[PDB]
């Protein structure tokens, strides 16, 4: 239904800083680097400008069922 097509146009017409983020990029091999990458994105966001973050497909992140064993 044209989901990313509008974020593309917003990235085109804007003047602000625009950071694309792969959804599953945070979960990585080494321990704890995920929350550190969250810190990284948000520190740079606080740094740059009035800016725009687009995170694609947070279904990789926001899953309402967990298992604190694995």
């Amino acid at each position: 239904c044209g989901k990313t097509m509008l974020a593309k146009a917003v990235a085109h017409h804007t003047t602000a800083a625009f950071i694309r983020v792969v959804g599953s990029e945070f979960v990585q091999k080494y321990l704890g680097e995920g929350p550190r990458m969250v810190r990284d994105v948000f520190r740079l966001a606080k740094e740059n400008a009035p800016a725009i973050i687009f995170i694609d497909e947070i279904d990789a992140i926001a899953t309402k069922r967990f298992d604190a064993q694995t």
């Binding site: 959804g23 599953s24 979960v27 091999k29 694609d56």
Partner: protein
């Protein structure tokens, strides 16, 4: 009486040739003796440049660091995303390197075995033609597509009954163009780790980005695909994140170029609707069971190098054939040879064929519900 010259020179010649062949061992092993003192060096990537001398890298196994360079490195070559070689103790930069290859890629880049040309398969020639124009043209000549002014399709989907010749068709294509057939089995991707499969996808698509005319083929998608869940088993999470890695890096912001993606499975009913949107997988190409002419074709393909005698009613064999695969007829030819091995008939009589067809059509009392049309 003057054979002393050749005797002394034979002494010198045997001594010279044996000195070469016995001191070249000392030479190469002394090169090894000098080489035994080299030190392994840490592999890492550069985050960014702090100052003219201060550099900030990340070790791939773990932590971050703040390092320095040599004096002959041409520091403008250090850019965010490069890969460097770090000292073990001094922990400074030694050398900028090209990107690594992740040998899983190498085991499906060059490992690919070729096959016979597209005349080996048969009876589905329209699909062969169609797949050829969607793949071979927009990398050999895309400007004809540009004259219309429409982007060629990105990926193509194969589907059908089991063993109608999908994988064999991909092998024919991989014998035809011979450029960059990255054939993924789509099942030995996931290993046991957290972001491992994602990192494999990143490596694959960046390697696809590098060697610009690439072909991706993933047989048996249903391992990696799934549909969706209410988060039943914790292992399914990682598959869904891997599939969203695929969904992102086939559409994304940085759009692809020339990476044609061939996709084949048995039943596309179990596939994710987010993958079956057009644009990621443009055309659903159907490969169905062969027709009477097509069964005749495949039978006259596999009966090529078979020593027979001329009483072969191919019409009766195809007429008694109904709802068969290509491998069904291959099994017919195999078991006809098996009946020929019975009672030591070195040739193949026509009586072998009817019995083999009866055995094969007898054995198919087991498999029903063979149709799974997508959406």
């Amino acid at each position: 009486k003057l054979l002393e010259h050749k005797e002394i020179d034979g002494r010198l010649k045997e001594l010279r040739e044996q000195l070469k062949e016995l001191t070249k061992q000392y030479e190469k092993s002394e090169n090894d003796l000098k080489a035994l003192q080299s030190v392994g060096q840490i592999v890492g990537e550069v985050l960014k440049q702090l100052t003219e001398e201060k550099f900030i890298v990340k070790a791939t196994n773990g932590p971050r660091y703040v390092v320095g360079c040599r004096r002959q490195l041409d520091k403008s070559k250090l850019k965010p995303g490069t890969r460097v070689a770090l000292d073990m103790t001094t922990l400074t930069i030694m050398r900028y390197l090209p990107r690594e290859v992740d040998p899983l890629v190498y085991n499906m880049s060059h490992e690919d075995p070729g096959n016979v040309s597209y005349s080996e398969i048969g009876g589905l020639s329209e699909q062969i033609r169609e797949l050829r124009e969607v793949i071979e043209l927009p990398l050999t000549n895309p400007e004809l597509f540009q004259r219309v002014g429409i982007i060629p399709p990105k990926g193509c989907l194969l589907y059908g009954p089991p063993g109608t010749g999908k994988t064999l068709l991909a092998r024919a294509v991989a014998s035809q163009l011979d450029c960059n057939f990255l054939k993924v089995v789509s099942s030995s991707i996931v290993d046991k780790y957290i972001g491992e499969s994602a990192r494999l996808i990143r490596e694959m698509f960046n390697y696809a980005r590098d060697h610009q005319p690439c072909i991706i083929f993933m047989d048996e998608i249903d391992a990696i695909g799934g549909r969706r869940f209410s988060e039943g088993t914790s292992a399914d999470r990682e598959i869904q994140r891997t599939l969203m890695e695929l969904l992102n890096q086939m559409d994304g912001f940085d759009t692809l170029h020339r990476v044609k993606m061939i996709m084949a499975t048995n039943r596309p009913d179990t596939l994710d609707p987010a993958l079956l949107r057009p644009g990621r997988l443009d055309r659903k190409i159907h490969i169905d069971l062969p027709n009477e002419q097509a069964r005749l074709d495949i039978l006259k393909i596999h009966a090529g190098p078979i020593t027979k005698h001329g009483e072969i009613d191919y019409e009766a064999i195809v007429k008694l054939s109904d709802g068969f695969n290509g491998a069904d007829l291959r099994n017919v030819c195999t078991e006809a040879g098996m009946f020929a091995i019975r009672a030591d008939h070195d040739f193949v009589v026509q009586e072998d064929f009817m019995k083999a067809v009866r055995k094969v059509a007898d054995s198919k009392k087991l498999e029903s519900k063979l149709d799974y049309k997508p959406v």
